[PDB]
Amino acid sequence: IVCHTTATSPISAVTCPPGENLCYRKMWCDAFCSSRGKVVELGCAATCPSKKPYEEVTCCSTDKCNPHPKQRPG
């Protein structure tokens, strides 16, 4: 497992160095940014540290798994 996956091979296949799911998963890069970029910044977890009360990081344990932008049932 590495970065993006989306349930497939072409995607989940080598990207970031060793680590759990590789490529960490944050919410909106702290309270500051105002860079408007869908969701999360991504980079390289391999440990998914930091974390915060309102969650600023997450552990996927299965590749990027960024797909954090979702609205209503589906």
Tokens of 23: 């490529």
Tokens of 36: 């408007």
Q: Give CA–CA dist 44/3, Å, rounded.
A: 8
What method did the depositors use to determine the structure? NMR
Q: Give CA–CA dist 52/74, Å, rounded.
A: 28
Coil vs helix vs strand at 54: coil
Q: Give CA–CA dist 24/58, Å, rounded.
A: 7
Q: Give CA–CA dist 69/6, Å, rounded.
A: 13
If you write DSSP's letter for every residue of 7-73 in order, what string do you get? Answer: SSTTTSSS-S-SSSSSS-B-SSSSS------SS------SS-----TT-S-B--SSS--------S-
Q: Which domains does the chain have, with CATH numbers?
A: 1-74 (2.10.60.10)
